[PDB]
Amino acid sequence: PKLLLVLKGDSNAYWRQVYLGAQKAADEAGVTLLHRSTKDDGDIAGQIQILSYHLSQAPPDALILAPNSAEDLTPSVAQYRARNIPVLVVDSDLAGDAHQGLVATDNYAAGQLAARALLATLDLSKERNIALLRLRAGNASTDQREQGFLDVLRKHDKIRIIAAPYAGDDRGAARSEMLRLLKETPTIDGLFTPNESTTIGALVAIRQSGMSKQFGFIGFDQTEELEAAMYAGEISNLVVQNPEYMGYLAVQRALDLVRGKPIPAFTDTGVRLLQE
Amino acid sequence: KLLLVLKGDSNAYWRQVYLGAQKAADEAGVTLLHRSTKDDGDIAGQIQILSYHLSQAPDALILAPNSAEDLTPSVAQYRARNIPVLVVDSDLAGDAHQGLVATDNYAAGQLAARALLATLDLSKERNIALLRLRAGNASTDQREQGFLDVLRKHDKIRIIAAPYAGDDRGAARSEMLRLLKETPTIDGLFTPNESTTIGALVAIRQSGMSKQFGFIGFDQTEELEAAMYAGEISNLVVQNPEYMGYLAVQRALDLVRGKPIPAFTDTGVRLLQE
Ligand SMILES: OC[C@H]1O[C@@H](O)[C@H](O)[C@@H]1O
């Protein structure tokens, strides 16, 4: 068998872990794994181009896709379905029901978790002003993290959501956005950033602004730099997924589809706070 | 005795806040003194009203400040005299006051952006205009920031105009007339309060541009409602000014009698139609 893996891009180190897990499973199975992603996360047009190119020029036995857009990728996936090529979605949900399954974090639950963690960092005897650094509307994973977070906090006594701008897919964009927020906002008491790039961008902005360790800060995903910032007390906690295990299971599920075996509609790959 | 100082009388909106405050005051059997400037945005005039009442007299002040920063010294003077201050409608900078009763204006701006997006053909690039009110007026600054925060990075959306109109509907009319003449294409518009919405509406009609683009307005009056039902305005984001005035008085009475209040009481916001 041959499996085509198309992730969101290369703008997060996260994706290398998903790929490494997928490659481990493909190696164990004795199957060929192709990996083709856009340079940048969020490049919807580029991802659609990769899918159509491989459908025409070198079609796989199954497609494993992390869609950059929950809606804008459905026509691409429907083309695979009409060619009877199974599609397994990884990491971030796809709209509709053209695909055969999902293997991902429960991203809505991860956001609720992040809000609970933030509440635990705050002095809840006073009103607290909260900022959310959103990623990009239509990116299902972060849209769900953002909504789960807001659903815990919106009516919470002593909590005010004072900022929720979109940062975009780039850590440079997240840095620019956070720098503006820090300058323009009177008091930020708590922050949540829903992925690797937004967490790293915000961190760099917080340091450059002389604001380290000043407020509660829940981030998402982990790298050596984020782990260090957390151990230093610059980040209050990180909500972390299991990207290697997710990549590994996505390959196993895709192979089940190739062999005509049933798979769960949703395989939840787990989420946790990195520290107590 | 409760002193109620709103922004001015440039918007029919303030009569609804006053009516709610008066209902609450009547129900509680307390005297309400409503004292506002003639025009919204008259910062110096509002400071004068506050200075006068400190010099000769109330048990609490309910204030809708014309400037989030410029009213802070006036409010601090009340705090130094231990007269509770409840801020209504539009936030005040600092922490000299005892609470806020208002729409969540930032969230209301985000709502307006989402409503505007729903009016647009998002298969194609769309040009968007925003009519700002006045820097330093917290309520509209927050609506504008919420709206922009949703849209500034949105695929296929370009913000091509964001001028300030000022507090008068006549000024909003002049500004919109200029935009309609000078801009090659406007695909969507947001106006963040009653005066800006009415001024834009009148300009759009006078330009022969009615029903040509998506238009989210803010606040409601019989005239704005008619325009919406006619399809001239796509939707209105509306506050609950009567409930806001009523709650502001009840919160002020709680302050007078020493019952703790929340720092922010969110009085709600919705789209007027589906
Ligand atoms: O979109 C940003 C990507 O970064 C990783 O957190 C996520 O799983 C997500 O899909």
Ligand SMILES: OC[C@H]1O[C@@H](O)[C@H](O)[C@@H]1O
């Ligand atoms: O400042 C303009 C005033 O008009 C009403 O929309 C508002 O609540 C606002 O404070």
